[PDB]
A paper describes a structure:
Dispatched (Disp) is a 12-transmembrane protein that plays a critical role in the Hedgehog (Hh) signaling pathway by releasing the dually lipidated ligand HhN from the membrane, a prerequisite step to the downstream signaling cascade. They typically contain a membrane-embedded domain splitting into two pseudosymmetrical halves with six transmembrane helices (TMHs) each and two extracellular domains that are associated with the two transmembrane halves.
This yielded the construct (dubbed wbDisp*) that consists of residues (1–111, 123–530, 542–1116). To obtain a model at this low resolution, the recently published structure of the fruit fly homolog (ffDisp) was trimmed to poly-alanine and fit into the map, followed by manual mutation and adjustments. The water bear Disp (wbDisp) has an overall similar structure with ffDisp and hDisp, despite that they only share modest sequence homology. Specifically, the inner leaflet part of TMH1, TMH3, and TMH6 shift towards TMH2, compressing the membrane core region, and this is repeated for the TMH1’, TMH3’, TMH6’, and TMH2’ in the C-terminal pseudosymmetrical half.
Numbering used by the authors: 11 to 79, 150 to 198, 205 to 247, 282 to 336, 342 to 446, 453 to 526, 561 to 642, 646 to 726, ...
Write the structure that this text describes.
């Protein structure tokens, strides 16, 4: 408005002063934050997300309660490196059988070990161990291998797959399977050698990565413990740094391509960093706000938002081609789009904050702060453009393509001419999207406790494939893991979406085991829990309470509940009082617990969560039946993973609803005349769901990362649609028909093209830079981009649908 125009004139008058007032702020923020704390440093690679679903609290509580109270025959602790049935390892095994190349590679690794990660021992052996008894020789003839294979097969009696005297060799085989009957060949070689013994330090790990690159007979996979976590940290460091740098480069390239701005555009990128600085600053005061993925989404979001802003500025410059006053008016029009984008981002933050996840919450905060930062950036960017106008050059690229804009215009025209046809195509795509959500199915599960895939690093990727080949070689060192207990210490988690330990010592509502009431209550618990857990199988059937009453009735003694509890605690004859129990030791008190095995533990939570839910209901009914109904947290280790998945699903849904709120807020910010962009926003959301489904087409499993990506994507898509939205809004009054839609699409097409290029660049740079560390994020970004472009072409058909029939 007038005052807004006045601020614009204030900026125009301060084409340099205004810019300084922001660039300096960025610098100061960078310094203060750097000095105050080392925010860029990340404590851990793991997300550690807290589900917060009435069960996550119980789990955290159980955790807290428990916490309250010949030569070189290296063991498993020594970092093992096994390569089996691989093209690289295959060459090694074939040459080992012929020229003994594998043995030489192992020796070379030992030589590298002497330098670092080396009393020091030469090397553990799997294949060299067999012939080692006869003699240690790098020659490695075939006759020795044949004899070794014969003894390996002779060891079928002890383990089906002399021979007993080679006990150490037998252990070697245990470590290296599928090399006896199959033989020492390219087929499942399973190196399994220990170059370093008991070495989880980071420096040996770094050397291990290079060693894994066959820099020191080709070895495919190697492993390291403890050192693996350090490697993952290094992965987050180097890989994310590279992808981010590439992102900045692409953004700069795009800026020059669109606006041919060599300093102001660069200043926009620097402004993105400034924004990150502001976010970091404000967040630090309110909380730690640290998460690796938070940084990843931060860089991605910044790239996209800044891209949008630059797109806005460029659109204004194109419309420009008093002049400063009209420039200001264009600044206002674009400011609307900037505001729309910011709205999308902020609501995205709201989505990630609704579901409290140690990871999702941080991403949300970074997004929100960076978003408001992007708004101030929308201002500064405008100032940057103003300065560009104030000065061209030091004191030159024509940047013009023949009929390119016209070519896009014609593309918009063709899309518009077949308004009915394109509309049908989009609707069909929407139907296909919903179908995908149905079939194969929206819900997905992770294949393990930590994550379905938890190795983004290449060397770590080899280590993961090694983990699988190890599962083949060595048995995974699953069974049921339920454990009902006495109570809950703190149902409320660490205050406000904060990853922390709310309490250290347990707590429970003061309840006493009334001799007649409690014993029978525990007995009933044992009976029903027997019907659910025992399942006619032998596994921790005895209950710390019923067994106690039994031992007491057998001992016949020496207010029965208190005395009996005291006697049992004093005695604890069987299984040391069932291992952990009576955690209420601060004062003489009796606590209860029970490790059960009702159902098998499954990595996937499709049914594992079904079982946890069934058990949850059974426990709920049991608690209902109990007369004192004293709260007891019946948590299970598996219940935690199931909850993580449940929370991920809850977050996705809450995010979608939040997206509904985003669309509503957008139209509320962009719809005062007759009609509303809600129809369009809904179409966009459908496109977002379509993108999610497309990710499924990419087989991206449903995981925390997948969730965060779905959120950021909802944002990117909303911004894409925002342009067309504001346009249709403005054009309806002017022509109210396919003609208005044509012109609106004409102006929109430019924005669409720019945003498309921006997203494509960010996604491409990020996905290739990291081999699965953040590749899922880049792929998701690309998916969002594709769905966005599709939705872009369909955006205008939406307007057509808005036109009266």
């Amino acid at each position: 408005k007038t005052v807004m125009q006045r601020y614009a004139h204030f900026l125009a008058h301060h084409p340099f002063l205004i810019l300084t007032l922001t660039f300096c702020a960025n610098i100061v923020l960078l310094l203060v934050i750097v000095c105050t704390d080392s925010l860029p440093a990340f404590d851990d690679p793991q997300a550690g997300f807290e589900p917060r679903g009435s069960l996550i609290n119980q789990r955290a509580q159980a955790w807290r309660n428990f916490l309250e109270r010949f030569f070189c025959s290296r063991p498993l602790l020594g970092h093992a490196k096994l390569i089996l049935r691989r093209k690289d390892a295959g060459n090694l095994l074939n040459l080992e059988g012929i020229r003994e190349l594998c043995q030489l590679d192992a020796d070379i690794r030992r030589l590298d070990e002497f330098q670092s990660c080396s009393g020091r021992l030469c090397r553990t052996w799997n294949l060299p161990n067999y012939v080692a008894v006869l003699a240690g020789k790098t020659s490695c003839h075939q006759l020795e291998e044949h004899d070794i294979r014969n003894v390996l097969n002779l060891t079928a009696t002890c383990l089906p797959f002399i021979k007993d005297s080679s006990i150490y060799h037998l252990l070697y085989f245990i470590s290296d399977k599928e090399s006896r009957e199959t033989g020492y060949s390219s087929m499942k070689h399973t190196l399994a050698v220990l170059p370093v013994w008991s070495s989880p330090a980071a420096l040996p790990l770094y050397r291990a990565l290079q060693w894994g690159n066959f820099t020191r007979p080709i070895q495919v996979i190697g492993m390291e413990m403890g050192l693996g976590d350090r490697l993952f940290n290094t992965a987050l460091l180097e890989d994310t740094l590279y992808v981010g740098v590439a992102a900045g480069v692409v953004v700069v390239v795009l800026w020059l391509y669109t606006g041919s701005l060599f300093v102001t555009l660069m200043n926009l990128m620097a402004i993105f960093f400034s924004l990150v600085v502001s976010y970091f600053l404000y967040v630090f005061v309110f909380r730690l706000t640290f998460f690796p993925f938070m940084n990843l989404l931060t860089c991605v979001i910044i790239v996209a938002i800044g891209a949008d802003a630059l797109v806005i500025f460029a659109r204004l410059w194109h419309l420009a081609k008093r002049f400063e006053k009209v420039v200001h008016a264009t600044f206002r029009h674009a400011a609307q789009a900037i505001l729309v984008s910011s709205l999308t981002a902020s609501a995205a933050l709201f989505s990630d904050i609704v579901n409290p996840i140690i990871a999702i919450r941080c991403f949300s905060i970074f997004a929100g702060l960076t978003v408001l930062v992007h708004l101030f950036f929308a201002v500064t960017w405008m100032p940057a453009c103003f300065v560009v106008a104030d000065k061209w050059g030091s004191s030159r690229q024509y940047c013009d393509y023949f009929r390119i804009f016209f070519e896009k215009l014609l593309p918009c025209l063709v899309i518009r001419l077949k308004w009915m046809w394109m509309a049908s195509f989009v609707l069909l795509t929407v139907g296909a999207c919903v179908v995908v959500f149905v079939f194969p199915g929206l819900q997905l599960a992770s294949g393990r406790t930590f994550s379905l895939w938890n190795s983004g690093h290449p060397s770590e990727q080899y280590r993961l494939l090694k983990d699988r080949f190890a599962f083949e070689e060595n048995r995974n060192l699953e069974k049921v893991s339920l454990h009902f207990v006495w109570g809950v210490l703190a149902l409320n988690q660490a205050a406000l979406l904060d990853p922390t330990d709310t309490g250290i010592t347990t707590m429970d509502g003061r309840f006493n085991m009334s001799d007649p009431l409690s014993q029978i209550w525990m007995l009933k618990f044992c009976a029903d829990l027997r019907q659910q857990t025992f399942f006619d199988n032998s596994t921790q059937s005895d209950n710390a309470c019923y067994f106690d009453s039994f031992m007491l009735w057998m001992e016949t003694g020496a207010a029965t509940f208190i005395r009996c509890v005291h006697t049992f605690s004093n005695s604890f004859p069987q299984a040391k009082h069932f291992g952990p129990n009576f955690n209420s030791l601060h004062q003489i008190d009796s606590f209860v617990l029970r490790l059960q095995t009702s159902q098998l533990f499954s990595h996937s939570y499709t049914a594992m969560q079904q079982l946890h839910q069934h058990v949850d209901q059974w426990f709920t009914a049991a608690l209902r039946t109990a007369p004192p109904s004293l709260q007891g947290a019946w948590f299970t280790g598996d219940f935690a993973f199931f909850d993580l998945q449940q929370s991920l699903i809850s977050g996705t849904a809450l995010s979608l609803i939040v997206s509904l709120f985003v669309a509503f807020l957008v139209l509320f910010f962009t719809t005062l005349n007759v009609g509303v962009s809600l129809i369009a926003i809904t179409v966009i959301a459908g496109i977002m769901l379509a993108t999610t489904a497309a990710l499924v087409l990419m087989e991206w499993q449903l995981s925390v990362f997948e969730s965060t990506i779905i959120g950021l994507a909802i944002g990117l898509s909303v911004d894409f649609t925002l342009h067309y939205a504001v346009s249709y809004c403005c054009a309806e009054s002017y022509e109210e028909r396919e003609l208005k839609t044509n012109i609106v699409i004409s102006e929109m097409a430019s924005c669409v093209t720019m945003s498309a290029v921006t997203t494509f660049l960010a996604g491409a740079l990020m996905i290739p830079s990291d081999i699965l560390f953040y590749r899922q994020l880049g792929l998701f970004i690309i998916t969002v981009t594709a769905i966005s472009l599709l939705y872009a072409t369909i955006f205008l058909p939406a307007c057509l649908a808005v036109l009266g029939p």
